[PDB]
């Protein structure tokens, strides 16, 4: 009695491999050139797999890097047909705006007049616009220049398209499969008892944020802490909570957009006279909901450390404006809010709305890429934004004297972490249809 | 029997099952196996998938399995690779654990299979010469 090897075809075998994921959408000008993606399947199949304990891990999958590269390529493809806003770097004679300006908003805006080219090359025109203090610098009635003048020039956002983050589904080609972890109490790294094979990712919102995750996916049943190494001080911390808190951001400045002919078919959209009252843009959050969310986060973080230690929340450490303040987009306008009012509480063992001021920056350089900036044109009317916070990015401070009084500060420079709280369930594997299981057959010999 | 609905096991649904249970879900996996930067990347991905399927089909074609999913071979199974009972390797082990168990001997098995099929074709040619 002996055995004989037999080769099998189409057997379920998985191998960790990296592939190129193609985008897909409902296919409903569009935003971020969504026509490049094939239409999605209206009936995505979900196959729950039993008796499987496949390993899952974050900070190593190529899906986050692929999404980052795809966002960069889509951004470049969207900004390529737009008009290059290169010749406005001139001597801008700026004065301060005192038209019913408040005490806090004083000095933020500057009325600048300059000579701009027109459709005819041999003629120029004296035009006036309004620029924020963050977009102009002084050169030694004064003269100012744009912040991106000594840096590489950049284009402007075309008003035909908007920055709406429509959901996108990342689907793998033939010969690859996508596995998701359906465990509600799924750890940051470890085996998942409930694995499900899915056609491709669910509606993923490509939101842009640097301090607080918003418009993302909510938790299953409770708060969860994710990190590649909890004991590592330099490693980022991603906290996700089930009940979202609503934030109401407003830009009460009723500015008027003005079109300036700067050449053949080139229109520069500048900020005209702001009619009505002027006030600083700001966001509001509920005090009770934020306190409850902070308490739940503290309770969930206390199990990772000792029950007798205390934890204090501090503001941003410093650096550039990209990471020291919460930067986001609403109605095409970029907001930079000072979140020092939220992380100003301590936690010891055992009419009601918080307001935080925000600044508007026109010369925006997203994706932390030196050069290749983007001029955000002004939006007519009062900008009203409503959002739900679905997570935060915390960072533990150094030192840690006697493992007590742990201070957490917001942060996060790279945008990959913004998607690490969304693509953590999903993973891609390569299927191997080859098997060599033996049996007692011999085959008809000739 | 006019309103009978037919449903089969899903794609990769027999991964956690036994060897014998997953042995009848090969056809579903076999049939489910198959602006310039986006087009070239998706085209390269599709071409790579087609080339991988072509390589697998050629690997089964050089052996005595030109088309059939289940096929035997006259070469025996040595106990150096895996010395396990047939009563428990087919009813108490999945394809993942079994593939990870002998993943170091796949190249040796493939090489012996190809040389055995080559000598089998030579023997068949010599037998037909009578």
């Amino acid at each position, epitope marked *: 009695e002996n055995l004989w090897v037999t080769v099998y075809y189409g057997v379920p075998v998985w191998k960790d491999a990296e592939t190129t994921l193609f985008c897909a959408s409902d296919a409903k000008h569009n935003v971020w050139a969504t026509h490049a993606c094939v239409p999605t399947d*209206p*009936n995505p*199949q979900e*196959i*729950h*797999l*039993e008796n499987v304990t496949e390993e899952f891990n974050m900070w190593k999958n190529n899906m986050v890097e692929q999404m980052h590269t795809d966002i960069i390529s889509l951004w470049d493809q969207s900004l390529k047909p737009c008009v290059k806003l290169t010749p406005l770097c001139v001597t801008l004679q700026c004065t301060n705006v005192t038209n019913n300006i408040t005490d806090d908003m004083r000095g933020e805006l500057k009325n600048c007049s300059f000579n701009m080219t027109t459709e005819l090359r041999d003629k120029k025109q004296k035009v006036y616009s309004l620029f924020y203090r963050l977009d102009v610098v002084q050169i030694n009635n004064k003269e100012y220049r744009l912040i991106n003048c000594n840096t590489s020039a950049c284009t402007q956002a075309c008003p035909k398209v908007s920055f709406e983050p429509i959901p996108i589904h990342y689907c793998a080609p033939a010969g690859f499969a996508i596995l998701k972890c359906k465990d509600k109490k799924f750890n940051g790294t470890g085996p998942c008892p409930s694995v499900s094979t899915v056609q491709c990712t669910h509606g993923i919102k490509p939101v842009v944020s640097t301090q607080l995750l918003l418009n993302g996916s909510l938790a299953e049943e409770e708060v969860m802490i994710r990190s590649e190494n909890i004991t590592n001080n330099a490693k980022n911390i991603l906290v996700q909570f089930n009940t979202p808190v609503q934030i109401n951001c407003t830009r009460p400045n009723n500015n008027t957009r003005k079109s300036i002919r700067i050449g053949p078919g080139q229109a520069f959209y500048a900020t005209g006279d702001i009619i009505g009252d002027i006030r600083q843009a700001h966001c509001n959050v509920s005090k009770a909901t934020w306190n409850e969310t902070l308490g739940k986060v503290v309770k969930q973080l206390r199990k990772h450390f000792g029950n007798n230690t205390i934890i204090r929340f501090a503001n941003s450490s410093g650096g550039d404006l990209e990471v020291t303040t919460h930067s986001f987009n609403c109605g095409g306008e970029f907001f930079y809010c000072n979140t020092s009012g939220l992380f100003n509480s301590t936690w010891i063992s055992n009419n009601d709305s918080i307001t935080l001021p925000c600044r508007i920056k026109q010369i925006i350089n997203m994706w932390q890429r030196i050069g290749q900036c983007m001029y955000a044109p002004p939006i007519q009317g009062v900008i009203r934004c409503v959002s739900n916070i679905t997570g935060l990015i915390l960072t533990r401070d150094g030192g840690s004297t006697n493992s007590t009084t742990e201070t957490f500060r917001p942060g996060g420079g790279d945008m990959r972490d913004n998607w690490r709280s969304e693509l953590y369930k999903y993973k891609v594997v390569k299927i191997e249809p080859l098997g060599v299981a033996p049996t007692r057959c011999k085959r008809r010999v000739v | *029997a*006019v*309103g*009978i*609905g*037919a*449903v*089969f*096991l*899903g*794609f990769l*649904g027999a991964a956690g099952s036994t060897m014998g249970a997953a042995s009848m879900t090969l056809t*579903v996996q076999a049939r489910n196996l198959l602006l310039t930067v986006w087009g070239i990347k998706q085209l390269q991905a599709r071409v790579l998938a087609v080339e991988r399927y072509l390589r697998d089909q050629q690997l089964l074609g050089i052996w005595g399995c030109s088309g059939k999913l289940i096929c035997c071979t006259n070469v025996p199974w040595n106990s150096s690779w895996s010395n396990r009972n047939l009563s428990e390797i087919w009813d108490n082990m999945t394809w993942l654990q079994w593939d990870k168990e002998i993943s170091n001997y796949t190249q040796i098995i493939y090489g012996l299979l190809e040389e055995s099929q080559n000598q089998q074709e030579k023997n068949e040619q010599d037998l037909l010469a009578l």
Partner: antibody, heavy 123, light 108 residues
């Protein structure tokens, strides 16, 4: 795998009656099901109105009520509707939504029947 | 259409009785018939499918026999929970029709 019916329990006469049945598909199963509607009056034998498939949608209606019955379905929200225009007093019965599908993996018929909803036609 | 015949309508039987229910068809059905049991306030449940195979989850006491236009349901040992209405449904071709019903109660 369970089925459930939903809709107005009490309806007025002469208008179109709409019923919705939610389906609980079997986990890790791909293929085609056969959804059908069967009503049963009080103290009377049940009556089958129509049926349809899940992948092709081939609707089969009873010749005695083909001019009023209408079966529709959608995979977007995974639901199937039943419409019966010009309801009469004889339409007062308990409606049931059934799903017939034979699982080739276990060789079982899986004849599941919903609890049914009582529909009364009166003014 | 197709008429479904079934006999009898109501009959008396005791616990552990050997009882059969007949069911006839207007045309040729061969073996595409199923037996259903319905209780007051409950949905019908499948008992015997294809006139010869026992459905999973059902007791082995129920049995079916017959072919063509004749069908018969047989009980080996009657039990008190079997007191319900029984129906015979054809599945050879459309439309789907049921029988007249058979109610079994305790004999006295």
């Amino acid at each position: 795998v369970q089925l459930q019916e939903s809709g107005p329990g009490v309806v007025k006469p002469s208008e179109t009656l709409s019923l919705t049945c939610e389906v609980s598909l079997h986990a890790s199963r791909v293929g085609s099901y056969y959804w059908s509607w069967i009503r049963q009056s009080q103290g009377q034998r049940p009556e089958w109105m129509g049926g349809l498939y899940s992948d092709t949608g081939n609707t089969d209606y009873n010749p005695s009520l083909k001019s009023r019955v209408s079966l529709s379905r959608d995979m977007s929200k995974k639901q199937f509707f039943l419409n019966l225009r010009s309801v009469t007093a004889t339409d007062t019965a308990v409606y049931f939504c059934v799903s017939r599908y034979v699982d080739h993996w276990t060789n079982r018929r899986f004849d599941v029947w919903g609890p049914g909803a009582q529909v009364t036609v009166t003014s | 259409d197709i008429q479904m015949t079934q006999s009898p309508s109501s009959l008396s039987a005791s616990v552990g009785d050997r009882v059969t229910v007949t069911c006839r068809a207007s045309l040729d059905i061969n073996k595409d018939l199923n037996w259903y049991q319905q209780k007051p306030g409950k949905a019908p449940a499948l008992l015997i499918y294809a006139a010869s195979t026992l459905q999973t989850g059902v007791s082995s006491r129920f049995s079916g026999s017959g072919s063509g236009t004749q069908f018969t349901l047989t009980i080996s040992s009657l039990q008190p929970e079997d007191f319900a209405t029984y129906y015979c449904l054809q599945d050879y071709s459309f439309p789907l029709t049921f029988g007249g019903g058979t109610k079994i109660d305790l004999k006295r």
